[PDB]
Design a protein around this ligand. Structure first.
Ligand SMILES: Nc1nc2c(ncn2[C@H]2C[C@H](O)[C@@H](COP(=O)(O)OP(=O)(O)OP(=O)(O)O)O2)c(=O)[nH]1
Ligand code: SF4
Ligand SMILES: [Mg+2]
Ligand SMILES: [Mg+2]
Lengths: 868, 186
DNA sequence: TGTCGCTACAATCGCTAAGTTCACGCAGTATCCTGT
């Protein structure tokens, strides 16, 4: 009679169906000998509130204190007589329950007894500011049915579920294969210690041509790759895809080449040619229904792809729209609106993966457009079809098949990127750790993850969490650097998980710090028991430490090693975000005093560590909120290691959990400013043999907002400076290279891409006020002016500042590379680059270098020293 | 020409323009630039030498309680010039009656120009009465003036003052008036 | 509809003050001017 299935996504409609939550997942049917998607509708998910009684009865209008003690019988009497009648709630279940509370609502005791009342979600919801003579507060008034269900059944991320007494739906409600109705939340349970089942992943890439008559983007091809047994706890399979399908259509007026049919047949692929975009969308929806993929992956799927799909579905009036998801509906959600909420709701029951968002979250790259990601991750070169060529493709079989195969290659690259970064396993792991829904986790962001983590923690400990909410404080201390060049050994010490360790050690928690609603609250007494937040953050830190130790194993697959590094970085960022969300104005758990206390303790620790190291007769040259740089003034590495171990032991001696470890040993350093240095990191090879690896931190060479010519020049200059060559040879080589680069720039022999400069976007190109015209924004608008996919917020744009005869400021001459290659009146501003991209960076880099000055750099660049 | 006889000329021979200029100079012992230029050119026309004019002007200007050193400093160069002694060194010619009529119009504190043109009819009548001119002669001169016949009006003055029925000459120059007066008298 | 935290550096734009040009002028001195 039981019913075991592995749930993946949950969807609730607060307005349409009250007190109903749908769980979508996979269920094993023996007959098919494979997993089949199933949907379970948990009905009658009642709504629960909590009432805080007064100490003595109080007149509502007089605001008096009659003196009559208030007990739970009186509270029930008041809610039964006044409130129940007023708000038209008929049946409710009342009980006395003792719960804990430590959050931001004044005059709420740490522990008290409340009259827990539940009633059907169809009944009206009580006002958030409700009050009465017998009670001073009502909680959980606006609690979402999904949240109530998840916290009531202690469901924490995707996992195997056991359902009791399943029933069948009168009429179909979902597009899945098996459906089941649960009459009560109590009938759903969780079973542990079973591997997740492989799921179906569908990677789709489409090509669209805009209808400038309406500027509406019409789809003309959809290349889709599918694998039906993609694992969620093992490595990605090779090849990543099992089978595939391609659908190709024609424009509104244009026609197919003569023998398109013969070429398509010779292609031997599962190509289905749709006469009209209506037929193409119908075929695509039928294919999605047949495969019923559980994880749809794509590039800009949340911003462009799904929105275009839904818009064209609406325009062509394709009957069964809801088949794009897994539930049955009739009216498509209104489009527009920020975020991908329209997309996610439209695709309810399917986990949408946007490799753009996932890549932004996991790794750091100069640009997030698909070609750059492909070159960086997969180390491959992508051929891009301009939209004009896409329009021109309906003129020959060869070009039409090339376009379709390019769509197929784009889909394959998207799937390859998803597998390489290991996006799905990491999403599953982080969702299990946090306890939220997987789709939200893959949507990006840290707030919801930490909020749900703490929700689960507190709920399991008999707490009442606050209702969802319908440089404020000091930070770290950066020591003043001793700018200069150090040719001896530098010892870098870094604290391990500093803020998490502080939270653990000092027992900082909502239930330990007695706050007050900008003074730093006192440290909690050492007598108190460990709080909830130290426990959760300790679990996260322990998981990260386990992963790091696993990374220590010798002879590991380097790709697997990089995946482990990504996972460790993700866990580190999760813990740091757990800290940060305490200081997030919009967070459910805003505890700015706690964050201020944490940062204050960090500053105190750093000051004490600096004092200790200086008291050891050792030079201190730098430190950024958890780290210290020491000048060993030694040339032997063994002695350096001995001193490092000494000082590390002395520092660790003063703490219970915080540990200091040797981050790195720099053979040479060029300390320029705060958060800006380059060093020759030393990684021992064995038997006294060490290998030197360059390491740049914060310089302009490691910023995407500089022309790659400048980056190359700075990299060479740093390489010369940090080398062991005699100083005269170093200066001579610097001068010679600078002269060569100046000649190359003057003669136009540099490749054009080296003049590109990348700047991201913060808002939509239109929403930017008329604050003159920010260079990138300028070009951004041009991109939207032209007939191509628009550039929205958070998009990198590469512009080249070029001569145009305008005698205007450089900021106002930003141009795309295609613009320069097209227009015959635009030429690269060589002087601008030589004076404002090459000179500034090298001049800043070589400030502490003897023999080099602004005038000399200008001369070797061929410029006029006058302005310098 | 001699300095002393200049007074006699001003009494009798000088035309009403130079007559008024001389009266103003002997009342004030100083002339503005326009008056100085005009009177110097006229004295050049009659024949007064550069030395004689310099001496006369120096002596007259000194009587206004001013240094003759300042005069030698300032008016010496001008007196040199108006006789064409310095600068362009051109023997600048005395003004003709047409120029005097069309020359710079005098303003308050000025006395240059042709009195017949730059004097109001009442003032001209009063001046003529002062000169004991017969009422008929004054009326004829006024009639000539009203029709803008200032040359003819001056010829009438010359006829009346010299006791000659007809002028016999077309008066077109103050120095010409001076020469005609000298011819009739001497 | 959600949107982790703070600190530091670099570049650019706006606005405004400080400074510069520099043309107003003056006090002092000088030369060269006007018609027939
Ligand atoms: N909220 C927040 N805090 C951060 C972030 N990055 C750094 N911090 C803070 C909290 C970290 O504990 C502290 C020390 O920086 P680190 O990069 O050395 O990380 P941590 O020491 O925690 O661990 P690690 O040295 O990498 O093993 O700086 C961040 O992105 N968000
Ligand atoms: S007409 Fe000639 S001479 Fe007579 S007052 Fe006039 S300017 Fe003098
Ligand atoms: Mg650290
Ligand atoms: Mg004068």
């Amino acid at each position: 009679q039981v019913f075991r299935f592995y749930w993946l996504d949950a969807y609730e409609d607060q307005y349409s169906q009250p007190g109903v939550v749908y769980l979508f997942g996979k269920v094993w049917i023996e007959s098919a000998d494979a997993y089949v998607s199933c949907c379970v509708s948990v009905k009658n998910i009642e709504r629960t509130v909590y009432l805080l009684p007064r100490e003595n009865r109080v007149q509502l209008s007089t605001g008096k204190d009659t003196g009559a003690p208030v007990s739970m019988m009186h509270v029930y009497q008041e809610f039964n007589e006044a409130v129940a009648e007023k708000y038209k709630i008929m049946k409710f279940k009342s009980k006395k329950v003792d719960k804990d509370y430590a959050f931001e609502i004044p005059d709420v005791p740490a522990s008290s007894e409340y009259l827990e009342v539940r009633y059907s979600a169809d009944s009206p919801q009580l006002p958030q500011d409700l009050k009465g003579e017998t009670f001073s507060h009502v909680f959980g008034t606006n609690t979402s049915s999904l949240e109530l269900f998840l916290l009531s059944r202690k469901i924490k991320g995707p996992s195997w579920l056991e359902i009791k007494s399943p029933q069948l739906s009168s009429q179909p409600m979902s597009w899945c294969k098996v459906e089941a109705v649960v009459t009560r939340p109590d009938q759903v349970s969780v079973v542990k210690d079973l591997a997740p089942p492989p799921v179906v992943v569908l990677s789709l890439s489409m090509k669209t041509v805009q209808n400038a008559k309406t500027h509406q983007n019409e789809i003309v091809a959809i290349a889709a790759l599918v694998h039906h047994t993609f694992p969620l706890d093992k490595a990605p399979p090779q090849p990543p895809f099992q089978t595939h399908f391609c659908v190709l259509s024609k424009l509104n007026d244009c026609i197919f080449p003569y023998d398109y049919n013969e070429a398509v047949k010779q292609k031997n692929a599962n190509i289905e040619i749709a006469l009209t975009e209506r037929t193409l969308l119908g075929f695509f929806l039928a294919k999605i229904h047949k495969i019923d993929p559980d994880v749809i992956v794509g590039h800009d799927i949340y911003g462009f792809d799904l929105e275009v799909l839904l818009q064209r579905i609406n325009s062509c009036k394709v009957p069964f729209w809801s088949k794009i998801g897994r539930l049955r509906r009739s009216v498509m959600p209104k489009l527009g609106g920020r975020s991908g909420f329209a997309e996610r709701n439209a695709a309810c029951g399917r986990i949408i993966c946007d490799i753009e968002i996932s890549a932004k979250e996991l790794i750091r790259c100069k640009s997030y457009h698909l070609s750059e990601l492909v070159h960086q991750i997969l180390k491959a070169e992508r051929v891009v079809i301009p939209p004009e060529n896409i329009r021109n493709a309906y003129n020959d079989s060869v070009h039409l098949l090339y376009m379709l195969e390019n769509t197929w290659i784009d889909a394959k690259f998207i799937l390859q990127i998803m597998c390489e970064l290991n996006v799905l396993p990491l999403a599953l792991q982080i969702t299990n750790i946090a306890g939220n829904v997987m789709s939200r986790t893959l949507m990006g962001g840290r707030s919801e993850r930490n909020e749900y983590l703490l929700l689960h923690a507190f709920t399991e400990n008999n707490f009442i969490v606050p209702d969802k909410p319908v440089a404020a404080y000091a930070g770290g201390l950066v020591l003043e650097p001793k700018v200069g060049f150090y040719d001896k050994f530098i010892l870098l010490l870094d604290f391990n998980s500093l803020y998490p360790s502080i939270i653990q050690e000092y027992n900082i928690c909502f239930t330990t710090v007695h706050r007050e609603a900008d003074e730093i609250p006192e440290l909690p007494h050492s007598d108190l028991e460990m709080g909830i937040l130290p426990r959760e953050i300790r679990k996260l830190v322990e998981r990260r430490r386990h992963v790091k130790q696993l990374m220590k194993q010798p002879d590991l697959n380097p790709d697997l090693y990089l995946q482990y590094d990504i996972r460790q970085k993700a866990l580190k960022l999760t813990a740091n975000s757990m800290y940060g969300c305490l200081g997030f104005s919009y967070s459910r758990f805003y505890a700015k005093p706690l964050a201020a206390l944490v940062t204050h303790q960090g500053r105190e620790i750093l000051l004490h560590t600096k004092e200790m190291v200086q008291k050891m007769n050792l030079e201190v040259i730098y430190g950024d909120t958890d780290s210290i740089m020491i000048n060993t003034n030694c040339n032997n590495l063994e002695e350096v290691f001995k001193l490092g171990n000494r000082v590390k032991s002395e520092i660790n001696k003063s703490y219970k959990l915080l540990e200091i470890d040797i981050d790195g040993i720099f053979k040479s350093l060029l300390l320029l400013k705060k958060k800006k240095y380059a060093a020759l990191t030393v990684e021992p090879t064995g038997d006294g043999k060490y290998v030197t690896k360059q390491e740049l931190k914060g310089l302009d060479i490691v910023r995407r907002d500089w022309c790659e010519l400048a980056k190359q020049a700075g990299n060479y200059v740093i390489s010369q400076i940090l080398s062991d060559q005699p100083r005269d040879s170093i200066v001579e080589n610097i001068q010679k290279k600078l002269t060569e680069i100046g000649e190359n720039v003057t003669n136009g022999t540099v490749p054009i891409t080296q003049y590109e400069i990348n700047k991201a976007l913060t808002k939509d190109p239109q929403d930017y006020p008329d604050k003159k015209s920010l260079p990138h924004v300028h070009v951004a608008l041009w991109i939207n002016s032209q007939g191509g996919r628009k550039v929205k917020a958070g998009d990198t744009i590469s512009y080249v500042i070029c001569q145009d005869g305008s005698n205007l400021s450089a900021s106002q001459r930003a141009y795309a590379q295609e613009q320069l290659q097209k227009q015959e009146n635009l030429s690269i501003d060589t002087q601008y680059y030589l004076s404002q991209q090459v000179h500034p960076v090298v001049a800043r880099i070589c400030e502490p270098i003897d023999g080099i000055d602004s005038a000399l750099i200008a001369m070797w660049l061929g410029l006029d020293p006058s302005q310098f | 020409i001699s300095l002393e006889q200049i007074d006699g000329f001003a009494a009798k021979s000088f035309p009403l323009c130079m007559r008024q200029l001389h009266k103003s100079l002997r009342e004030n012992h100083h002339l503005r630039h326009g008056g100085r230029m005009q009177y110097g050119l006229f004295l050049k026309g009659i024949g007064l030498t550069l030395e004689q004019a310099l001496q006369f002007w120096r002596l007259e200007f000194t009587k206004g309680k001013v240094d003759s050193e300042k005069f030698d400093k300032v008016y010496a160069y001008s007196i040199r010039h108006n006789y064409g002694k310095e600068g362009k060194r051109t023997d600048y010619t005395p003004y003709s009656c047409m120029k005097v009529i069309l020359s710079n119009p005098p303003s308050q504190g000025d006395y240059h120009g042709c009195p017949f043109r730059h004097s109001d009819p009442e003032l001209l009548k009063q001046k003529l009465q002062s000169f004991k001119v017969p009422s008929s002669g004054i009326n004829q001169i006024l009639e000539l003036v009203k029709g803008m016949h200032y040359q003819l009006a001056c010829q009438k003055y010359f006829e009346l003052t010299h006791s000659v029925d007809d002028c016999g000459f077309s008066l077109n120059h103050p120095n010409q008036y001076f020469a005609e007066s000298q011819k009739l008298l001497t």
